[PDB]
């Protein structure tokens, strides 16, 4: 009968190729045992891909959070980042008026009475290369350049007007090529959403007057209707545009 119960002679379920007995091992709070150095490397290496996520801290066996006293030096800065993203995500959800969504208010569902968890799941945050702050990159591998994840404040090509409440703390730009929030800033000049960035050769090559007009989907998609997915008036597709304060924009 196939069981995930650990044996003395088992392989480490991070590295797979060496026995737990072959190098120093720790017993995590969840009860599972791993090499010390493997646990350390996992916490150093963090998440896969540009979006800030926290699945990497899951025990490979039971998926509970990895925790041990000797890992506190690596876990502390992760916890700090977690709390910063969670705080920002929740605030964005509240300012969007989405914190009483049915996915939060219905007893028994995954995010019941957990608006901050809902928001972390809903929204994609990124680390700004320049200021090191987590920034919002829209609603949700390692073949990317971390130096091209830059927040709106740090890529402020239009010298946008300040938010009276927030300054530039939540300043965001659109994708140059579609009605989406920017993730990447390339060439020192150009904002891209993730999808347009994936097709950046084609997108930068399309003659400007042939780009889709608002409402524009990524990768040159002409959407139907006359309502901008960003709910703002903006210049023609193919021009940079500061969306202003990402939390105040909703209302303003
Ligand atoms: Zn190992
Ligand atoms: Zn475990
Ligand atoms: Zn920044
Ligand atoms: Zn785009
Ligand atoms: Zn638009
Ligand atoms: Zn604001």
Swiss-Prot record:
- Positions binding Zn(2+) 5 in this chain are 175, 178, 193, 196
Chain positions recorded as Zn(2+) 1 binding sites: 12, 15, 35, 38
**Tissue expression remark:** Expressed in all tissues examined, expression is exceptionally abundant in brain and thymus. Colocalizes with TSC1 and TSC2 along the neurites and in the growth cones. Highly expressed in peripheral and central neurons. Colocalized with TSC1 in one of the filopodial extensions at the tip of a growth cone.
- Which superkingdom? Eukaryota
Q: What is the effect of changing residue 187 to A?
A: Reduced E3 ubiquitin-protein ligase activity in threonine discharge assay
Q: Which residues form the active site?
A: 186
Residues binding Zn(2+) 3: 128, 131, 151, 154
Q: How is it modified after translation?
A: Autoubiquitinated.
Query: Site (Important for catalysis): which residue positions?
Result: 187, 192, 200
Kindly list the positions annotated as binding Zn(2+) 4: 163, 166, 245, 248
UniProt region (Tandem cysteine domain), positions on chain: 123-252
Where are the annotated RING-type zinc-finger regions? 12-63
Q: Which residues bind Zn(2+) 6?
A: 179, 214, 228, 234
Location(s), subcellular: Nucleus; Cell projection, Axon; Cytoplasm, Cytoskeleton
Binding residues annotated for Zn(2+) 2, in chain numbering:
30, 32, 59, 62
Q: What is the effect of changing residue 186 to S?
A: Retains activity while also forming a discrete monoubiquitin adduct that is resistant to thiolysis but is reversible after base treatment
Q: Which proteins does it associate with, and in what oligomeric form? A: Interacts with MYC. Interacts with TSC2 (tuberin) when TSC2 is in complex with TSC1 (hamartin). Interacts with FBXO45. Interacts with RAE1. Interacts with CPNE1 (via VWFA domain) and CPNE4 (via VWFA domain). Interacts with (sumoylated) RANGAP1; interaction with sumoylated RANGAP1 inhibits E3 ubiquitin-protein ligase activity and promotes MYCBP2 translocation to the nucleus. Interacts with RAN. Interacts with ATP13A2; the interaction inhibits the ubiquitination of TSC2 by MYCBP2. Interacts with USP11.
Domain note: The PHR domains are compact beta-sandwich folds composed of 11 antiparallel strands and decorated with conserved apical loops. They are likely to play a structural role and mediate interactions with substrates or partners.
The entry's function note states:
Atypical E3 ubiquitin-protein ligase which specifically mediates ubiquitination of threonine and serine residues on target proteins, instead of ubiquitinating lysine residues. Shows esterification activity towards both threonine and serine, with a preference for threonine, and acts via two essential catalytic cysteine residues that relay ubiquitin to its substrate via thioester intermediates. Interacts with the E2 enzymes UBE2D1, UBE2D3, UBE2E1 and UBE2L3. Plays a key role in neural development, probably by mediating ubiquitination of threonine residues on target proteins.
Family according to the record: Belongs to the RING-Cys relay (RCR) family.
- UniProt-recorded name of the protein: E3 ubiquitin-protein ligase MYCBP2
Q: Which organism is it from?
A: Homo sapiens (Human)
């Amino acid at each position: 009968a196939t069981s995930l119960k650990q044996d003395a002679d088992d392989m480490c379920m991070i590295c797979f190729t060496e026995a737990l007995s072959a190098a120093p091992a720790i017993q995590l709070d969840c009860s599972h045992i791993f090499h010390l150095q493997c646990c350390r490397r996992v916490l150093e290496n963090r998440w896969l891909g540009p979006r800030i996520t926290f699945g990497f801290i899951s025990c490979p066996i039971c998926k509970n959070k990895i925790n041990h006293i000797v890992l506190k030096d690596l876990l502390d800065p992760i916890k700090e980042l977690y709390e910063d993203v969670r705080r920002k995500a929740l605030m964005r959800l509240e300012y969007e008026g989405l914190h009483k969504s049915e996915a939060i208010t219905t007893p028994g569902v995954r995010f019941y009475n957990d608006p901050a968890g809902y928001a972390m799941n809903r929204y994609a945050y990124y680390v700004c290369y320049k200021c090191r702050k987590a920034y919002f990159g829209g609603e949700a591998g390692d073949d990317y350049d971390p130096r091209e994840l830059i927040c709106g404040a740090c890529s402020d090509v239009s010298r946008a007007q300040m938010c009276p409440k927030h300054g530039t703390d939540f300043l965001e730009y659109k994708c140059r090529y579609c009605c989406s929030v920017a993730v990447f800033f390339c060439f020192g000049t150009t904002h891209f959403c993730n999808a347009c960035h994936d097709d950046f050769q084609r997108m930068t090559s399309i003659p400007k007057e042939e780009l889709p007009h608002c409402p524009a989907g990524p990768k040159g998609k002409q959407l139907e209707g006359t309502e901008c997915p960003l709910h703002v008036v903006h210049p023609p597709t193919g021009e940079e545009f500061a969306l202003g304060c990402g939390v105040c924009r909703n209302a303003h």
